[PDB]
């Protein structure tokens, strides 16, 4: 949804990331209601990419319009007018939060307004001729789902908005305890939910099809996608939430999406949190988790990988996919069927054969030793090269689907292609060390320890906490929104009953009539710029209802006396506890780990390639060379420059010496220097290397 609503300032006919100074990367005062000032990339594209506001529309000429309420003679009317920046500058626009009477008359004589150049000033009520519609008009869709946004710094809000788009779908989703109300609309308009077309009753409901009868007499059948790979490898499946015989209405949600529960966006889970250092395992933005998350598959996601191999038509011969595989053992081909492909549901480990393809090799002059070995063992030398598809390094899972394309079956294959088979591998990844978790307020951090159930500090009732957050990270980052969210979440999943006896309490004068009491496990909504205040939050904390034992575990300050899991002695001071809604981000060590001992090399310059998918090495940049020179380690720098990167004979000699246990040979001349020499001579520059005598040294040794 955010990608579909993105405004980009880069491309043909626009700016560039290099030719743009600190003049366009600023929030002009005309962005109020037309472009979100919070949501923008935090990398090199900061300020050049944004998102539309919630209420922003587009003019026929291409300008962006926002609605305003027309107010005349100090009385706010019910007519909405859309004004662009030019039409907004001439008028004076008030604030959406200004108090109004029952008819529309302003109670106060001073009203906050915005002038032509912004000029936030107080003017009389008769001067006002326009007013905003909602306090959350300036924010986008993603930023409108952060509770207590006004208490957070702009940088923290930006980071939270950016990280909120990287959450992965979990096996089972759970709606947040505290939300902002912009979750039903986001889920419905995102498109991954199923919406009934006409009212009626449900006839047949299954895991893969839903049939809805209608009052008119027309039957509608809905097909639900089940375990379909998305663009980024995650799993997207839809599950019904209706029952046979239930009566639905037009516009009602019938089946949830990947991250959806009953039509509400749900990207994470509600976990009990404690704000305290713990033995240094949560030092410097780290996170400690309980083992209950691993045991009960709370933070578990399904990732689907696709492997494809094609047998095209070659000049030297024809490529055929079959289970010949001339040089293997017998146990490798246990899982392959008659046509040379793995069976559906057969688990494949790293290095296992998925698709067996044999391609012609052509006439080659084999070494005499190889010919002698083949003659002795009787394995005939056939002009075939083994090109079997194997599971890449560090990947595994369970095969769930195989799709085979053939030209003879009337398929629109590209020219020169005869066979094409794609194999899908599905894997369930549990939470583990190194995976990144983050909330909605810009607080991120990798997991450094997963303690068992017994080691976690537990409430006096006996409930262990599930996640522990460092204290020192909150004050220095100005994100007390997370503390307020924790307090309100604890109030939310406890139930409260305000004692209205002897008059309504002073702090609860402005509370709605439906917030005076709520049962346990209730859900609350806190809009962005008009929600719960500090006083109401404190009153709710002080008026919660006890647990099944008739005791209150958290006092009026939001703190509790946690015990110690591994010692048994209670902590000397109370610790803040509550429920925090955290998200699992798409930065997993399963995809970030990389290593290399010997791999592919480039063509023009004999250097290793780059990238995890290409099995490349890590770049040793100029700054690392400066550091090595500063240390004084000449030999390490020499070896890194020559015998690991460019010395062609040096690499093989080093590998042989390491295998045989001998000494590492002396390095030679890197090939990049010879390439530079050949490039200089092509510019009519007579570069020659002189020896001690003065005669040139030839570079054509071989």
């Amino acid at each position: 949804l955010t990608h579909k609503r993105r405004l980009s300032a880069l491309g043909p006919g626009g700016l560039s990331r290099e030719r743009a100074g600190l003049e366009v990367r600023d929030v002009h005062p005309s962005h109020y209601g037309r472009m979100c000032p919070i949501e923008t990339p935090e990398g090199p594209n900061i300020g050049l990419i944004g998102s539309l506001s919630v209420y922003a529309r587009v003019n026929p000429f291409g300008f962006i319009e926002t609605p305003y309420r027309k107010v005349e003679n100090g009385v706010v009317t019910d007519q909405i007018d859309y004004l662009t920046a030019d039409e907004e500058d001439r008028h004076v626009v008030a604030q959406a939060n200004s108090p109004t009477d029952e008819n529309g008359r302003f109670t106060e004589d001073r009203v906050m307004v915005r002038k032509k150049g912004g000029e936030v000033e107080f003017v009389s009520a008769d001067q006002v001729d326009y007013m905003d519609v909602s306090p959350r008009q300036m924010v986008s869709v993603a930023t409108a789902m952060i509770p207590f946004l006004e208490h957070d710094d702009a940088n923290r809000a930006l980071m939270g908005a950016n990280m909120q788009r990287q959450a992965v779908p979990l096996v089972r989703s759970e709606a947040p305890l505290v939300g902002t109300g912009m979750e039903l609309r986001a889920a419905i308009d995102a498109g991954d939910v199923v919406v009934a077309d006409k009212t009626g009753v449900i006839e047949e409901v299954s895991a893969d099809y839903i049939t809805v009868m209608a009052d008119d007499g027309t039957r509608q059948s809905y097909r639900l996608r089940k375990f379909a790979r998305s663009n980024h490898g995650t799993c997207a499946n839809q599950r019904p939430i209706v029952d046979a015989g239930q009566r639905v209405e037009a516009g009602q949600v019938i089946a949830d999406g990947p991250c959806t529960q009953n039509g509400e966006m749900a990207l994470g889970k509600n976990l009990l949190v404690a704000i305290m250092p713990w033995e240094g395992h949560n030092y410097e933005d780290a996170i400690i988790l309980s083992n209950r998350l691993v045991e009960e598959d709370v933070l578990t996601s399904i990732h689907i990988e696709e492997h494809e191999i094609d047998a095209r038509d070659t000049k030297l011969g024809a490529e055929e996919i079959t289970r010949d595989i001339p040089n293997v053992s017998d146990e490798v081909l246990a899982d392959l069927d008659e046509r040379g492909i793995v069976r559906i549901g057969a688990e494949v480990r790293d290095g296992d054969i998925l698709v067996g393809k044999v391609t012609p090799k052509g006439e080659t002059e084999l070494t005499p030793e190889e010919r002698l070995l083949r003659a002795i063992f009787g394995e005939k030398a056939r002009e075939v090269r083994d090109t079997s598809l194997k599971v890449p390094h560090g990947e595994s899972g369970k095969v769930i689907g195989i799709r085979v394309f053939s030209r003879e079956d009337d398929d629109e294959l590209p020219a020169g292609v005869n066979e094409l088979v794609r194999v899908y591998v599905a894997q369930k990844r549990k939470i583990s060390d190194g995976d990144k978790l983050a909330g909605r307020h810009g607080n991120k951090g990798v997991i450094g320890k997963i303690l068992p159930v017994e080691d976690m500090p537990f409430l006096p009732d006996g409930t262990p906490v599930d996640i522990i957050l460092n204290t020192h990270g909150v004050p220095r980052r100005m994100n007390i929104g997370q503390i307020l969210e924790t307090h309100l979440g604890w109030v939310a999943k406890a139930g409260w009953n305000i004692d209205v006896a002897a008059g309504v309490p002073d702090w609860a004068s402005k509370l709605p009539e439906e917030l005076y009491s709520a049962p346990a496990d209730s859900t609350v909504a806190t809009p962005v710029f008009d929600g719960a205040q500090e006083g109401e939050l404190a009153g709710l904390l002080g008026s919660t209802l006890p647990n099944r034992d008739g005791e209150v575990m958290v006092d009026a300050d939001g703190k509790s006396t946690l015990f110690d899991g591994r010692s048994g002695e209670p902590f000397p001071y109370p610790v803040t506890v509550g429920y925090m809604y955290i998200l699992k981000l798409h930065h997993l060590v399963d995809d970030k780990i990389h290593a290399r001992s010997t791999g592919p090399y480039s063509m023009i310059t004999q250097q290793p390639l780059g990238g995890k998918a290409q099995f490349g090495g890590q770049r040793f940049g100029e700054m690392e060379c400066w550091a090595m020179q500063a240390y004084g380690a000449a030999y390490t720098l020499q070896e890194l420059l020559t015998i690991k990167s460019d010395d062609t004979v040096g690499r093989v000699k080093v590998y042989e010496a390491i295998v045989k246990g001998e000494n590492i040979p002396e390095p030679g001349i890197p090939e990049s220097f010879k390439v530079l020499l050949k490039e200089l001579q092509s510019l009519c520059l007579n570069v020659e290397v002189l020896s001690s005598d003065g005669a040139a040294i030839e570079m054509r040794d071989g």
Binding site: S206, E295, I302, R343, G345, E454, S567
Partner: protein, 225 residues
């Protein structure tokens, strides 16, 4: 110096809960005993739970059964909530098989001799007029948490679906001290520990097993001197 040895008493709060009191104890010693008992109860109490299932018409976990509202993943997630007690060391096999419209619960599973299900009211799957479910489960004993065992390691077939097992039958254990026992001085603790189980075993048996394990450990900690 007091020669009055401590004694243990039991009081029942509910069917599956109990409260035990140990008194008198030396000052500063009530907490540590409670912590040791809680850790042993939550860590090393043996039990029984399912380990693998095999549905009729499916081959892997990431699929759906025709006529069933819940796919195989949801069925597996629901099946992890079964509390089953077994007294046979080697794995046993249970059978579940229902056809036609209705709701499949834990009461439709027919267990062999020596194996029982303590919650014949949970929800597994719901079937319409065109759905048939036939799944056989394997029950094995153990303790702690054991992850899924792969087909390659176990040398199983394709239709067998490994399932995570949680053998621990203890839900929630807490403790509190009073420091109210007085014989000649007013500084003697009184440990009060609350035990709750998953109805698989009575709390008395869980406490007895924890006491036995700790007796073995603290006996080997002194006999090998």
């Amino acid at each position: 110096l007091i020669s009055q040895r401590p004694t243990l008493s039991e009081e029942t709060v509910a069917e599956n809960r109990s409260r035990f009191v140990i008194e008198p104890l030396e000052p500063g010693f009530g907490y540590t005993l409670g912590n040791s008992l809680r850790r042993t109860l939550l860590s090393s109490i043996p039990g029984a739970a399912v380990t693998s299932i095999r549905i009729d018409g499916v081959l892997h976990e990431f699929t759906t059964v025709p006529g069933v509202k819940e796919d195989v993943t949801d069925i597996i997630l629901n099946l992890k909530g079964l509390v089953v007690s077994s007294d046979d060391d080697e794995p046993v096999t249970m059978y579940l098989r229902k056809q036609g419209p209705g709701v499949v619960t834990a009461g439709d599973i027919v267990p062999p001799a020596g194996v029982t299900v303590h919650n014949p009211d949970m929800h597994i799957a719901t079937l319409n007029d065109k759905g048939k479910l036939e799944v056989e489960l394997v029950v094995e004993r153990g303790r702690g948490y054991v992850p899924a065992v792969q087909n390659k390691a176990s040398g199983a077939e394709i239709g067998r679906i490994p399932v995570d097992s949680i053998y621990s039958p203890v839900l929630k254990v807490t403790y509190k001290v009073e420091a109210t026992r007085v014989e000649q001085r007013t500084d003697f603790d009184k440990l009060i520990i609350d035990v709750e189980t998953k109805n698989s075993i009575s709390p008395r048996d869980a406490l007895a097993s924890a006491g036995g394990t700790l007796v073995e450990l603290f006996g080997l900690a002194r006999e090998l001197n």
